[PDB]
Write an enzyme that holds these catalytic residues in place. Structure first.
Site: not given
Lengths: 74, 161
Positions: B88, B95-97
């Site tokens: 992710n 960062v993918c969140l």
């Protein structure tokens, strides 16, 4: 003087009080004494950077209720 | 000076104040300094420690947090530096969140502690439904034993020296 909280992995909460200019070297040895382990058996960190003996709370810009993490020196 | 940063600078000042007094063990979140020595609350250099009992354990992963003028309306931009091997995390390091998305789960009330703890949980609990990088994803999905070595290797390469 200033209030500092020394914590660790085991969550051991131990507060202290030291002048704004006092040599941090003292408290470094102090904790090891309060505790019950060799001096070079513990490492003290603050804001990430490791705390040196000749350092000064005024140099590190520390403040009241601040926290200082302690890791078993390796 | 960004005269458009009034609200953010105010919110970031109290954010920093609340972190000093109390924050998770092993973590690091400090503002960067300007060309001279002024404190730059719009650009933070943070550190996320690997969670114990996990292959990430013992690693101390660095990432920079970037706040925009409209913050806290909009979430900060988070980017691991250097780029991290994880499904992710984009190759760029971003960062993918969910809580870092305005169009999704981000709320102005979310703290830096919440963001950092959120990212720390993502490390060992990735979201394969929505991969950001091809490599880490493919390995995680095709050879978890190999995925674990890479992660352990990465944790060792970023252990506090």
């Amino acid at each position: 003087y200033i209030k500092l909280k020394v914590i660790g992995q085991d969550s051991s909460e131990i507060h202290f009080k030291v002048k704004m200019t006092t040599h941090l070297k003292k408290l470094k040895e102090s904790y090891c004494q309060r505790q019950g382990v060799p001096m070079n058996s513990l490492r003290f960190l603050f804001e990430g950077q490791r705390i040196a003996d000749n350092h000064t709370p005024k140099e590190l810009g520390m403040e009241e209720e601040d926290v200082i993490e302690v890791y078993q020196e390796q | 000076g960004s005269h458009m940063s009034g609200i953010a600078l105010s919110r970031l000042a109290q954010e920093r104040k609340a972190w000093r007094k109390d924050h998770p063990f092993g973590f690091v979140a400090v503002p960067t300094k300007n060309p001279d020595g002024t404190m730059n609350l719009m650009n933070w250099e943070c550190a996320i420690p690997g969670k114990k009992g996990t292959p990430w354990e013992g690693g101390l992963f660095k990432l920079r947090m970037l706040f925009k003028d409209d913050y806290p309306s909009s979430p900060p931009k988070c980017k691991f530096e250097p780029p991290l091997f994880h499904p992710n995390v984009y190759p760029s390091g971003t960062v993918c969140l969910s809580i870092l998305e305005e169009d999704k789960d981000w709320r102005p009330a979310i703290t830096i502690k919440q963001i950092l703890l959120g990212i720390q949980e993502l490390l060992n609990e990735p979201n394969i439904q929505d991969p950001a990088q091809a490599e880490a994803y493919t390995i995680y999905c095709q050879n978890r034993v190999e995925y674990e070595k890479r992660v352990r290797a990465q944790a060792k390469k970023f252990a506090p020296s």
